[PDB]
């Protein structure tokens, strides 16, 4: 997997490494799941999420 393609399968940030290697990362206020691609909030008000909408669907 490569970051230039389909975002390397990452939900958020992607880094290419030496080889057929890739690491996904998450913005502050998120953590990376064991799938190695998904990001989940770790705080009440993570960036780029709309609370009234997140709740509206919670």
């Amino acid at each position: 997997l490569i970051c230039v393609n389909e975002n390397g399968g990452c939900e958020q940030y992607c880094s290419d490494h030496t080889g057929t290697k890739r690491s996904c990362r998450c913005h502050e206020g998120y953590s990376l799941l064991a799938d190695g691609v998904s990001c989940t909030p770790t705080v009440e008000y993570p960036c780029g999420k709309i609370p009234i909408l997140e709740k509206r669907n919670a």
Partner: protein, 250 residues
């Protein structure tokens, strides 16, 4: 914003209103509790920096509902390469005197990594632009926060489809050529926000140009991806006396 709709209260929680002596100046974008991104040109004519206020959680300017949070601006940082009264490098980083408190109505927009922004976000067709700007060319400003979905153009296409300042690598075009839909005076500094896999990111800043919703022309936006590293470095720096700071770019 021309040809948009009201952003339902709380659905644009990163939107900032900038005031000078209580008067509407420009918009901005909250990127964390003490940092706001705006447009350099907003500050070209500022006499007394102490009169500059940022407001978060604003919606309807006609009323006070208690979700609003006002802050003094401690620093206005502009790239060295920006020339007043022009379009290129039309970006500013504002440090608030005190953090805003995150609430349902006050939330930062994610400042993306450059690679992500360039490789991924830049290819998302539609993004949202917002503000309390003019509702029409040569018209009154909005009392309620407005939002508009605009498609992004590759610069080559922009040029072709257009019928003026240049379009540099530090900008991009978005919107419509039919004069129906645009950002406008009063909106400058505000966000061009891009959705990807359930999260929103800062990709553009409402800049300026030739009229608003002018047939044959597209909206011009500062290409935030070009500035990520510059912003990040500044956000790691200690404040300096005197509000205005010109910082080397790159």
């Amino acid at each position: 914003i021309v040809g948009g709709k009201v952003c339902p209260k709380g659905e644009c929680p990163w939107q900032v209103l900038l005031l000078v002596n209580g008067a509407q100046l420009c918009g901005g974008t909250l990127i964390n509790t003490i940092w706001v991104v705006s447009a350099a040109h907003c500050f070209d004519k500022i006499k007394n920096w102490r009169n500059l206020i940022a407001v978060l959680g604003e919606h309807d300017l006609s009323e006070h509902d208690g979700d609003e949070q006002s802050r003094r601006v401690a620093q206005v940082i502009i790239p060295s390469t920006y020339v007043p009264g022009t379009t290129n490098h039309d970006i500013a980083l504002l440090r608030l005197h005190q953090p805003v408190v995150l609430t349902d109505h006050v939330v930062p927009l994610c400042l993306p990594e450059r690679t992500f922004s360039e490789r991924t976000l830049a290819f998302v067709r539609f993004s949202l632009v917002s503000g309390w700007g003019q509702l029409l060319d040569r018209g009154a400003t909005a009392l309620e926060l407005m939002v508009l979905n605009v498609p992004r153009l590759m610069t080559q296409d922009c040029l072709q489809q257009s019928r003026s300042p240049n379009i540099t690598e530090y900008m991009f075009c978005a919107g419509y050529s039919d004069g129906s839909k645009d950002s406008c005076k009063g909106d400058s500094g505000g966000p061009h926000a891009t959705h990807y896999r359930g999260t929103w990111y800062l990709t553009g800043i409402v800049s300026w140009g030739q009229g608003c919703a002018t047939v044959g022309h597209f909206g011009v936006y500062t290409r935030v991806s070009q500035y990520i590293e510059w912003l990040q470095k500044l956000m790691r720096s200690e404040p300096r006396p005197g509000v205005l700071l010109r910082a080397p770019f790159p």
